[PDB]
Amino acid sequence: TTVPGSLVWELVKKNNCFLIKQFGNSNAKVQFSKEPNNLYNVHSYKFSGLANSKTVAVQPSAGEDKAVVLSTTKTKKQNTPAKLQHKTLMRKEFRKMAKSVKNQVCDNYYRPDLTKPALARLSAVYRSLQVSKSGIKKKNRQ
Amino acid sequence: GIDLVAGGRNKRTKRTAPKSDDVYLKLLVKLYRFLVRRTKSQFNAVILKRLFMSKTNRPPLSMRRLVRFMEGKEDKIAVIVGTITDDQRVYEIPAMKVAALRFTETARARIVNAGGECLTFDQLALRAPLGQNTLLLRGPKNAREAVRHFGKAPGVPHSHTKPYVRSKGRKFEKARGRRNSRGFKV
Amino acid sequence: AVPLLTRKIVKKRVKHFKRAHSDRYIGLKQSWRRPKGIDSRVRRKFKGCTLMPNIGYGSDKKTRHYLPNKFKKFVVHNVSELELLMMHNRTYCAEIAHNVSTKKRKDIVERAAQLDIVVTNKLARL
Amino acid sequence: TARPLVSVKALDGDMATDAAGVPMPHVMKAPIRPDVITFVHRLVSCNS
Amino acid sequence: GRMFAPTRIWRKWHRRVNVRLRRVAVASALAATAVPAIVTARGHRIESVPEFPLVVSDSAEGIEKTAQAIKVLKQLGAYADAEKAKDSVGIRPGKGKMRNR
Amino acid sequence: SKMALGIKRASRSHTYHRRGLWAIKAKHGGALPKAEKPAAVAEPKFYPADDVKPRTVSTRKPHPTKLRSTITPGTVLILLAGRYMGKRVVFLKQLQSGLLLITGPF
Amino acid sequence: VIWTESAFKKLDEVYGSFEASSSKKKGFVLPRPKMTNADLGRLINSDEVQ
RNA sequence: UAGGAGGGCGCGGCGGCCGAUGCAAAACCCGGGGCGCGAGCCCGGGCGGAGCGGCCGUCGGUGCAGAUCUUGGUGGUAGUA
RNA sequence: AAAUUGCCGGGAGGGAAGCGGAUGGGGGCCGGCGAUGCGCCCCGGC
Ligand SMILES: [Mg+2]
Ligand SMILES: [Mg+2]
Ligand SMILES: [Mg+2]
Ligand SMILES: [Mg+2]
Ligand SMILES: [Mg+2]
Ligand SMILES: [Mg+2]
Ligand SMILES: [Mg+2]
Ligand SMILES: [Mg+2]
Ligand SMILES: [Mg+2]
Ligand SMILES: [Mg+2]
Ligand SMILES: [Mg+2]
């Protein structure tokens, strides 16, 4: 974003390639945003992955077991897309993943907004990989 | 059953957000929403309510009137929520600090070459958020050519309203109702 | 895969709002059309005649669009937009769209089982 | 006196030169005005 | 019989925009080309382009062949986008597939 | 006198007397003790996506269900429901959970 | 947009700047935005406002 | 009610974006399941056998129960006169 | 495709039928129609 974050939001709050909107524009409207670096994929300015300098992504890696990528945008390198995101491939267990995410998101005051949400997505991604490894042992309905 | 007019719901209307979907104007709107909410300055209230205006409620104000309004008040920052047009009828303009939406590219050059500083409303919100030492202004609203047509009808006594005429001349609405010698004098 | 809704779903009317005089004729569809007559017993709302939709029959905002499952539905065409319900599976339910292939449905359902997303169509096209 | 430079990304088989960036145009900094863009694009695409 | 109010050739087909308004709009579009979030929102695959605004040397001017143009796109990051268009070509749904579109 | 009980309970001085702030003026000096920052778990196994809420220990302390005036340990009662409807039994005593405890005798 | 290095350096000569007759187009100067800085974060969180 | 305005639903194109489709598209049928107050929408099953949808902007020969409406079909009258 | 007709299976009928609101009785259809998992522990190796 050469232009500021608020302006990018006012530019893309109504249409962009990563926005999946269904059920019309009535009270039934359902809105998600499917860019890689949006955590809840909720299309709001808090979570928007395009209108922000400081964004974090938590994704399962390519085909390989139990490797999670945590990426944070580099604020200063921002007009350089090839060197725009600091990606971090970590493969340790969950408690040491959570400490490192807190290190990279909340503890350095990078963006404490998304302290809890980034960790929640980390839990979801981790257990997704865990069940891709083991299988459906639990119906997860109680 | 209760004896109310339209169930009590307010029947007047006002703007609550500009019809204009200009993103910069929406950002000023957000800023001044914050300011009027957290600051409680009546000046911010008026500025907000005047960003919620149409371009016929935001007429241009030229320097020949702005300088009148700045004659002896150079300490206070002029604010006009509208447009500043130049006016080739004035010669010496005091170095003045004016905040506005737009500056006609010749009027902004006039002000800069006169040595004043030419602001936008965000720069105004920097060094006068509550509006310290500011001079709010409005351009002439009823000066618009269309307004010369409004009011009581052209053909009733004492009305000086311009009637819609497709062209001026002797043949275009001068005959009967505009003089004694053909009918009556309006 | 456990519903998040903690409020009982209440519906002020479950019966549909069929068009007045949809019964006597076949050409009239069942869908509602406001009777515009000047002497229409439906528009004058005599008792014993069909009920019109008001706004008063509206349902609670916090229990609106929840299926009987207690999830709001979201229709997905592919794995790409299936996977973006990771942090909504307690409140959003995927439905694979009606025109996908059975092959892609197997893939979406396999993916949704491991992302733990409720799906109401996992027994479709097989 | 400050404007950023844009480094030119040379290609393969490109001669070595002691070259620097092109300074950022002022046009590339103009207000981004989506409503005017959509209005003007509506009319110009109706103009064909 | 007829159609109601038959279509006539003297509709307003071409609309006029002020020359200065066209120029202002071209200015805003050029400005919007420079912002990586706007391009990425607008739908171009740019995760490997070196710099914005993406500028290549004049050695590009001399190329002749389409393979050479592809090779040029390979140093840049554009070729992901070019492939996106190439594999997203598909028949236009609707009457356009028989109105010469 | 439910109202008089309510007033006497609601009086500030008697609220002191009930909540027993005295004998809390005994243990911790002659001043009311401080509270601290417990619960240093710092070991969350799993992060729920929605806003987190933990389980309730019900801190509310319901009044025991009151017994009828015309019931005294030693009455003969009449059952009404269940398989023993109509049986005439003996009320021994009200057990602690709030239900009557009866015998036939068997 | 991918600009070649010839086009990029004359984009200034074509569209110009905030100066009369600087552009190769007659009667045209770049529009100026209604805000110099559009960072509501910095405005609202500036020392002056806060 | 006459009337006025706002917000939406829906049909068909164009400029864009995201997709589906011979492991079955469009259409149509259903005592199938739902969502919305409602226009309407989503899913299931069958026939079907090749295309189709969603979102943003925008455009239009755009929404039918009447007009002794127009074209085509079908009834009761009637196995009667 | 509907209008409309036939056959098969069901239903109901004292000079109309159809429709609205109640449930009730039949059907027909719904397993995201309705759960079995959390914490504590000890091995037995991973
Ligand atoms: Mg009342
Ligand atoms: Mg007179
Ligand atoms: Mg009447
Ligand atoms: Mg028509
Ligand atoms: Mg029709
Ligand atoms: Mg008809
Ligand atoms: Mg009608
Ligand atoms: Mg039929
Ligand atoms: Mg009879
Ligand atoms: Mg009935
Ligand atoms: Mg019933």
Side-chain angles (χ1 to χ4, degrees):
Chain A
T1 62
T2 309
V3 298
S6 198
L7 186 71
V8 181
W9 177 242
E10 295 283 355
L11 283 196
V12 309
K13 68 183 291 294
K14 186 175 180 180
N15 68 187
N16 66 53
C17 82
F18 300 113
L19 168 70
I20 301 299
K21 178 206 311 185
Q22 302 154 338
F23 286 167
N25 212 45
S26 47
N27 60 48
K29 170 176 56 178
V30 167
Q31 303 213 66
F32 295 105
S33 66
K34 68 181 179 67
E35 61 250 56
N37 71 63
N38 181 333
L39 291 159
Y40 287 160
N41 290 319
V42 175
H43 169 235
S44 54
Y45 175 59
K46 165 181 178 169
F47 290 110
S48 66
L50 294 174
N52 296 31
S53 299
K54 290 183 293 182
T55 49
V56 311
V58 175
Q59 294 308 12
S61 170
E64 190 277 331
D65 291 331
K66 300 298 292 295
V68 171
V69 298
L70 162 72
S71 296
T72 62
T73 300
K74 327 177 203 309
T75 61
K76 185 180 288 293
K77 281 74 176 175
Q78 185 177 182
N79 61 282
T80 300
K83 296 182 289 294
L84 175 59
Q85 69 275 17
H86 180 220
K87 66 185 288 184
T88 300
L89 182 63
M90 320 282 302
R91 66 185 183 273
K92 275 73 70 177
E93 62 86 19
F94 178 80
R95 306 249 182 171
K96 296 183 289 293
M97 294 299 291
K99 291 177 70 67
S100 67
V101 175
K102 292 177 71 68
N103 184 349
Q104 295 298 109
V105 163
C106 183
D107 300 335
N108 56 0
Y109 299 137
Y110 180 107
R111 186 184 199 201
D113 295 330
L114 281 69
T115 300
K116 155 170 301 160
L119 281 191
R121 183 176 176 87
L122 184 64
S123 278
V125 159
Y126 177 49
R127 63 179 292 165
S128 177
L129 290 180
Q130 185 177 3
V131 299
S132 66
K133 183 178 184 293
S134 66
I136 301 299
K137 63 174 144 53
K138 62 184 180 293
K139 186 184 287 185
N140 209 47
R141 184 174 293 172
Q142 209 180 125
Chain B
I2 191 167
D3 188 358
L4 276 296
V5 175
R9 282 84 60 85
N10 179 264
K11 301 174 58 179
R12 292 180 179 91
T13 69
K14 66 182 181 180
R15 291 180 182 270
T16 62
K19 297 296 292 296
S20 178
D21 60 357
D22 192 35
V23 297
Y24 298 69
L25 181 71
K26 305 172 151 186
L27 292 165
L28 305 171
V29 171
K30 286 183 186 173
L31 173 68
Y32 280 94
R33 290 272 173 52
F34 175 83
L35 295 170
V36 74
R37 179 157 57 75
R38 294 280 302 278
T39 300
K40 300 305 172 195
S41 69
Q42 315 180 54
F43 174 88
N44 290 138
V46 192
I47 300 299
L48 185 50
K49 170 87 208 303
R50 293 190 186 173
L51 280 71
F52 303 163
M53 294 296 172
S54 55
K55 67 183 289 184
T56 63
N57 297 294
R58 301 189 324 243
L61 186 151
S62 59
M63 283 75 75
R64 183 179 63 83
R65 207 166 178 86
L66 186 69
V67 173
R68 182 178 292 171
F69 288 147
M70 295 298 103
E71 182 65 26
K73 293 187 286 185
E74 62 86 19
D75 189 359
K76 292 174 72 175
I77 190 167
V79 171
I80 191 66
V81 63
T83 300
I84 298 298
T85 52
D86 63 357
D87 192 73
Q88 296 294 321
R89 310 167 297 182
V90 285
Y91 319 111
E92 294 102 312
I93 297 89
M96 47 177 66
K97 297 182 290 294
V98 298
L101 276 297
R102 291 169 19 90
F103 285 82
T104 62
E105 294 294 328
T106 300
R108 176 194 297 274
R110 178 65 61 84
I111 287 190
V112 168
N113 297 131
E117 173 205 359
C118 182
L119 302 201
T120 62
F121 271 84
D122 63 357
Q123 303 177 254
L124 170 79
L126 294 174
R127 66 184 184 273
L130 178 142
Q132 288 70 240
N133 297 295
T134 187
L135 200 65
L136 185 49
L137 286 188
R138 288 175 280 203
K141 194 170 77 175
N142 280 354
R144 185 176 64 247
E145 197 67 7
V147 176
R148 298 289 164 52
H149 302 272
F150 300 118
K152 65 179 73 66
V156 298
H158 296 285
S159 66
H160 293 285
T161 49
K162 185 184 287 184
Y164 293 121
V165 171
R166 76 167 186 262
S167 175
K168 290 175 70 176
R170 50 176 262 271
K171 293 188 287 185
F172 300 103
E173 293 180 354
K174 297 291 180 68
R176 178 186 158 278
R178 282 289 164 51
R179 49 163 46 80
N180 305 336
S181 179
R182 275 71 173 175
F184 56 102
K185 180 69 176 177
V186 69
Chain C
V2 64
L4 188 153
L5 184 46
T6 177
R7 182 65 60 84
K8 293 187 286 185
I9 298 97
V10 176
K11 296 222 199 293
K12 312 167 170 175
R13 182 184 171 91
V14 298
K15 310 222 199 183
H16 283 86
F17 275 102
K18 289 189 298 173
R19 191 192 313 195
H21 300 248
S22 179
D23 72 345
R24 291 170 48 220
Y25 309 78
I26 297 89
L28 279 76
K29 302 290 95 175
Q30 295 297 109
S31 55
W32 173 252
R33 296 291 185 269
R34 184 176 177 87
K36 298 291 180 68
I38 57 181
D39 287 329
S40 198
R41 292 185 292 113
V42 192
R43 175 192 69 81
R44 312 210 270 181
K45 294 181 177 67
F46 299 104
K47 87 196 170 303
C49 308
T50 62
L51 313 181
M52 292 180 183
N54 294 346
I55 193 66
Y57 286 107
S59 66
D60 185 343
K61 293 186 286 185
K62 293 181 176 66
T63 65
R64 212 157 49 182
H65 295 291
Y66 292 94
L67 295 174
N69 286 6
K70 295 180 176 67
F71 305 87
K72 294 181 177 67
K73 67 184 289 183
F74 173 71
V75 296
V76 298
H77 297 77
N78 62 6
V79 176
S80 161
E81 73 199 8
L82 181 82
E83 66 183 1
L84 62 84
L85 270 55
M86 272 172 186
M87 283 73 74
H88 295 269
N89 52 60
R90 278 191 100 239
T91 180
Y92 277 87
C93 182
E95 286 205 339
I96 299 91
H98 81 285
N99 80 74
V100 296
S101 66
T102 187
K103 182 175 71 68
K104 187 178 290 293
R105 289 166 171 270
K106 295 184 289 293
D107 283 349
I108 302 178
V109 176
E110 190 277 331
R111 184 61 175 179
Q114 69 177 240
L115 277 60
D116 186 48
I117 285 171
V118 64
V119 184
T120 55
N121 291 10
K122 65 179 73 175
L123 274 171
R125 277 207 183 101
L126 73 165
Chain D
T1 56
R3 275 184 325 172
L5 277 296
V6 193
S7 178
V8 173
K9 180 67 174 66
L11 313 190
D12 291 331
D14 186 75
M15 295 298 102
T17 175
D18 279 328
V22 176
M24 275 282 323
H26 289 172
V27 65
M28 295 299 290
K29 182 67 180 294
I32 288 182
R33 180 67 180 271
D35 62 358
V36 167
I37 301 299
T38 187
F39 179 29
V40 178
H41 184 270
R42 184 210 145 191
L43 292 189
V44 176
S45 64
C46 294
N47 193 359
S48 47
Chain E
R2 289 177 289 111
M3 65 179 288
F4 162 65
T7 56
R8 302 268 185 257
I9 61 180
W10 57 85
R11 208 167 298 189
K12 287 231 199 183
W13 310 101
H14 315 281
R15 317 305 272 263
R16 217 177 79 254
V17 294
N18 305 349
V19 178
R20 195 183 180 95
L21 187 45
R22 293 193 229 97
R23 294 176 181 174
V24 163
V26 168
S28 290
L30 280 184
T33 64
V35 181
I38 301 299
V39 182
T40 301
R42 186 264 184 275
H44 298 266
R45 319 257 281 281
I46 59 171
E47 293 84 3
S48 75
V49 298
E51 293 293 328
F52 269 107
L54 178 59
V55 177
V56 310
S57 296
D58 291 331
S59 75
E61 294 294 329
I63 63 171
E64 305 172 287
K65 317 271 295 172
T66 300
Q68 294 179 356
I70 300 299
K71 180 68 172 66
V72 163
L73 264 61
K74 299 301 217 323
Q75 293 83 17
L76 283 71
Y79 193 70
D81 189 358
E83 293 179 353
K84 177 203 64 172
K86 190 183 316 163
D87 50 34
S88 178
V89 65
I91 298 170
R92 180 194 298 267
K95 293 186 286 185
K97 66 178 74 175
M98 68 186 156
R99 304 268 178 90
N100 296 295
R101 305 186 292 265
Chain F
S1 63
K2 296 184 290 294
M3 179 63 69
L5 187 153
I7 313 287
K8 182 174 72 68
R9 186 179 295 276
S11 179
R12 178 65 179 87
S13 174
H14 183 74
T15 299
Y16 206 84
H17 181 74
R18 292 184 292 112
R19 297 189 49 65
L21 276 296
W22 51 272
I24 297 170
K25 294 290 184 70
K27 297 291 181 68
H28 295 89
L32 294 174
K34 182 68 173 66
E36 68 276 16
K37 181 68 173 66
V41 172
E43 263 178 14
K45 183 177 178 180
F46 182 76
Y47 291 118
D50 60 357
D51 189 358
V52 66
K53 278 74 68 178
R55 176 150 297 275
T56 49
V57 295
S58 51
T59 68
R60 300 202 179 275
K61 187 175 182 180
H63 287 331
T65 176
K66 67 184 289 184
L67 170 65
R68 293 180 181 177
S69 190
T70 186
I71 301 297
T72 300
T75 61
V76 174
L77 302 184
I78 304 298
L79 294 175
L80 293 174
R83 65 176 300 177
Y84 293 145
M85 68 193 146
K87 284 296 187 196
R88 288 186 263 250
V89 299
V90 181
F91 158 78
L92 295 174
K93 63 92 175 179
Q94 189 167 2
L95 62 83
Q96 191 274 331
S97 178
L99 295 177
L100 271 62
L101 183 63
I102 62 170
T103 186
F106 182 75
Chain G
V1 176
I2 297 170
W3 277 282
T4 61
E5 192 276 332
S6 59
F8 198 35
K9 67 176 72 66
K10 67 182 289 184
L11 184 63
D12 291 331
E13 188 71 33
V14 173
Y15 289 77
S17 60
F18 300 129
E19 289 166 11
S21 179
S22 66
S23 296
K24 176 182 280 213
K25 314 187 170 201
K26 182 174 72 68
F28 174 70
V29 299
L30 275 297
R32 306 153 164 291
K34 282 179 182 170
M35 305 204 279
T36 62
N37 176 30
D39 188 358
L40 293 175
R42 186 179 295 276
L43 276 296
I44 297 169
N45 293 319
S46 65
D47 196 70
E48 296 82 340
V49 181
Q50 213 68 27

